[PDB]
Amino acid sequence: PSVFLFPPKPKDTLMIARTPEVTCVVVDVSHEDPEVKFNWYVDGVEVHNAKTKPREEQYNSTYRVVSVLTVLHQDWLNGKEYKCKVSNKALPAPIEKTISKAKGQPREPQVYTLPPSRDELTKNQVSLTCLVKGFYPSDIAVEWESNGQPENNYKTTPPVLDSDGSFFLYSKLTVDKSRWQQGNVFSCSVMHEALHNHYTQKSLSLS
Amino acid sequence: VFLFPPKPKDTLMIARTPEVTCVVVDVSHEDPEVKFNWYVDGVEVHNAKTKPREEQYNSTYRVVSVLTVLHQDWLNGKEYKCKVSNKALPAPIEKTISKAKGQPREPQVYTLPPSRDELTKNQVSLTCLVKGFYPSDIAVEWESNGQPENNYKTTPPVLDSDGSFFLYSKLTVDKSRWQQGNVFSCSVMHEALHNHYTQKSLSLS
Numbered sequence: 001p002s003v004f005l006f007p008p009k010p011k012d013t014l015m016i017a018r019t020p021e022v023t024c025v026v027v028d029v030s031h032e033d034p035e036v037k038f039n040w041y042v043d044g045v046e047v048h049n050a051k052t053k054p055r056e057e058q059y060n061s062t063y064r065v066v067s068v069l070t071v072l073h074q075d076w077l078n079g080k081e082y083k084c085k086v087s088n089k090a091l092p093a094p095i096e097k098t099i100s101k102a103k104g105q106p107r108e109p110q111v112y113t114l115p116p117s118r119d120e121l122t123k124n125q126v127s128l129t130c131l132v133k134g135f136y137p138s139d140i141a142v143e144w145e146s147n148g149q150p151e152n153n154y155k156t157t158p159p160v161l162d163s164d165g166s167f168f169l170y171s172k173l174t175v176d177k178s179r180w181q182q183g184n185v186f187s188c189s190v191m192h193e194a195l196h197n198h199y200t201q202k203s204l205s206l207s
Numbered sequence: 208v209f210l211f212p213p214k215p216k217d218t219l220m221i222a223r224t225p226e227v228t229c230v231v232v233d234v235s236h237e238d239p240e241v242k243f244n245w246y247v248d249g250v251e252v253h254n255a256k257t258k259p260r261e262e263q264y265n266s267t268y269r270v271v272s273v274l275t276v277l278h279q280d281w282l283n284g285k286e287y288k289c290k291v292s293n294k295a296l297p298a299p300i301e302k303t304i305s306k307a308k309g310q311p312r313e314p315q316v317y318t319l320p321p322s323r324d325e326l327t328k329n330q331v332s333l334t335c336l337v338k339g340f341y342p343s344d345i346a347v348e349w350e351s352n353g354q355p356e357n358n359y360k361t362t363p364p365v366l367d368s369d370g371s372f373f374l375y376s377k378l379t380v381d382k383s384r385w386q387q388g389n390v391f392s393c394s395v396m397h398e399a400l401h402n403h404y405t406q407k408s409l410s411l412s
């Protein structure tokens with residue numbers, strides 16, 4: 001009977017309006033002994049606003065019960081740690097997992113937008129590039145848009161540990177070749193803690 | 208028990224020696240002994256290279272086999288079965304591996320110069336976008352003046368929306384080396400590429 005612990009989504013914590021939550025998934029408890037008690041601890045202080053939600057079978061014959069705790073944006077951001085104590089009877093001792101933000105100096109992502117190579121203009125779809133380097137920690141969130149409306153054909157690479165201990169990532173946005181050729185401005189929106197207001201944005205259009 | 212593919216570069220260069228490894232973490236002092244029957248497309252092979260058995264410290268060892276595959280064999284999608292007979296197990300464990308099936312596609316390679324906004328700095332970013340390839344085994348490298356570069360980092364391959372993959376490679380040079388006009392080059396090595404190897408250049412305009 002194994003147990004997992006997941007951080008809040010980046011976006012959740014850096015937007016006061018949203019609700020960040022750590023999840024304590026428990027895959028594999030057995031029919032034999034079903035019962036599970038979730039004592040949540042925050043910086044050690046036991047919390048009681050647990051949200052142990054029910055309970056879902058599967059196609060391997062073992063359950064999966066999940067808890068959820070709502071963290072404060074600040075609590076998480078300031079590096080507090082969330083302990084999940086999972087008491088079952090298939091185990092001699094209750095399993096534990098601690099999680100928290102990544103320690104160390106948060107650093108401001110730099111954001112450069114990179115136009116399509118000349119060599120791609122042969123095509124009828126074109127690549128816009130957003131290079132976001134220099135950040136820490138690696139929780140971050142990138143999105144594309146134009147004319148105030150969002151874009152949906154973009155994909156983003158994972159954050160890569162750069163040589164200086166910071167992270168980079170790229171975002172590629174794929175538009176029709178004409179939309180660029182005319183002069184539409186497009187924008188890359190980054191959202192990261194070490195950004196002023198947790199959010200910057202760079203633009204990009206034909207010259 | 209685990210099973211690892213040859214490195215991309217090994218298979219796409221006739222001169223190198225691609226090899227699948229059958230790592231076995233965790234056998235116990237109690238019962239040490241392990242026999243490695245390798246099978247290729249089912250046909251049992253006997254050029255096994257079971258390399259020695261190194262009783263690791265957590266009282267669990269780790270014995271490794273190695274098989275040398277032919278470049279062809281791998282590239283044509285043959286499958287490599289590893290059958291690991293121990294006595295802590297009732298039945299011998301199995302793992303099969305092979306290349307990824309599916310139409311290999313030629314990577315397009317575009318080199319992208321530094322944003323204007325980075326010229327404030329004293330180190331500058333060169334970008335190599337390599338999109339459209341399949342399978343995702345690929346190898347990217349940077350160089351200039353025929354000599355190699357060493358300050359570059361590369362993102363994993365990302366599953367693009369059309370089933371193909373992209374990745375980017377960032378090379379970090381001093382701001383002057385660019386400002387002057389040094390050509391730099393991104394070297395990609397992938398199966399669907401003619402001669403398994405293309406290369407694009409990049410310099411100040």
Ligand SMILES: *[C@@H]1O[C@H](CO[C@@H]2O[C@@H](C)[C@@H](O)[C@@H](O)[C@@H]2O)[C@@H](O[C@@H]2O[C@H](CO)[C@@H](O[C@@H]3O[C@H](CO[C@H]4O[C@H](CO)[C@@H](O)[C@H](O)[C@@H]4O[C@@H]4O[C@H](CO)[C@@H](O)[C@H](O)[C@H]4NC(C)=O)[C@@H](O)[C@H](O[C@H]4O[C@H](CO)[C@@H](O)[C@H](O)[C@@H]4O[C@@H]4O[C@H](CO)[C@@H](O)[C@H](O)[C@H]4NC(C)=O)[C@@H]3O)[C@H](O)[C@H]2NC(C)=O)[C@H](O)[C@H]1NC(C)=O
Binds near residue numbers: 209212264265268
């Ligand atoms: C007792 O000790 C031994 C070793 O003793 C040591 O004790 C001290 C002294 C220290 O030295 C310690 O280092 C060490 O603990 C322990 O043995 C370890 O056991 C674990 C599992 O029990 C193994 O983990 C696996 O690791 C692989 C990948 O690891 C690569 O990179 C590692 C470096 O971080 C390296 O350790 C590995 O050797 C390996 O490196 C590659 O080597 C090959 C072979 O030559 C080479 O070609 C490559 O060059 C090289 N790689 C490169 C390029 O760098 C990991 O992939 C495994 O994960 C699979 O299984 C997981 C569950 O166990 C699962 O969660 C994962 O999802 C994954 O399953 C797969 O998932 C991927 C998704 O991407 C995908 O393939 C599939 O979806 C799925 N596969 C399928 C379909 O099944 C795995 O975690 C360690 O390798 C091993 N350590 C050693 C020595 O390698 C042992 O743990 C101890 N005893 C106990 C009780 O724990």
Ligand SMILES: *[C@H]1O[C@H](CO[C@@H]2O[C@@H](C)[C@@H](O)[C@@H](O)[C@@H]2O)[C@@H](O[C@@H]2O[C@H](CO)[C@@H](O[C@@H]3O[C@H](CO[C@H]4O[C@H](CO)[C@@H](O)[C@H](O)[C@@H]4O[C@@H]4O[C@H](CO)[C@@H](O)[C@H](O)[C@H]4NC(C)=O)[C@@H](O)[C@H](O[C@H]4O[C@H](CO)[C@@H](O)[C@H](O)[C@@H]4O[C@@H]4O[C@H](CO)[C@@H](O)[C@H](O)[C@H]4NC(C)=O)[C@@H]3O)[C@H](O)[C@H]2NC(C)=O)[C@H](O)[C@H]1NC(C)=O
Binds near residue numbers: 025
């Ligand atoms: C029978 O069925 C179930 C379910 O079927 C499963 O899913 C279906 C769809 C098929 O693909 C099946 O093949 C597959 O089996 C099986 O249940 C599985 O149980 C295993 C092990 O117990 C789990 O493996 C782990 O995977 C987690 C990752 O889980 C996240 O992502 C998953 C997919 O992305 C998702 O399923 C999870 O819900 C979760 O996703 C997140 O969910 C949260 C909220 O819950 C949400 O906030 C997020 O939005 C969402 N995230 C997103 C976007 O995806 C992973 O944590 C584990 O990896 C660690 O542990 C391994 C130990 O073996 C180790 O080898 C790994 O390398 C890795 O090690 C960790 O490393 C990190 C840093 O590298 C370190 O911090 C940790 O300390 C270290 N942990 C260690 C050492 O323990 C692990 O790989 C499966 O996720 C789980 N499947 C599902 C769907 O839940 C079941 O096993 C089957 N029966 C069998 C075969 O026994």
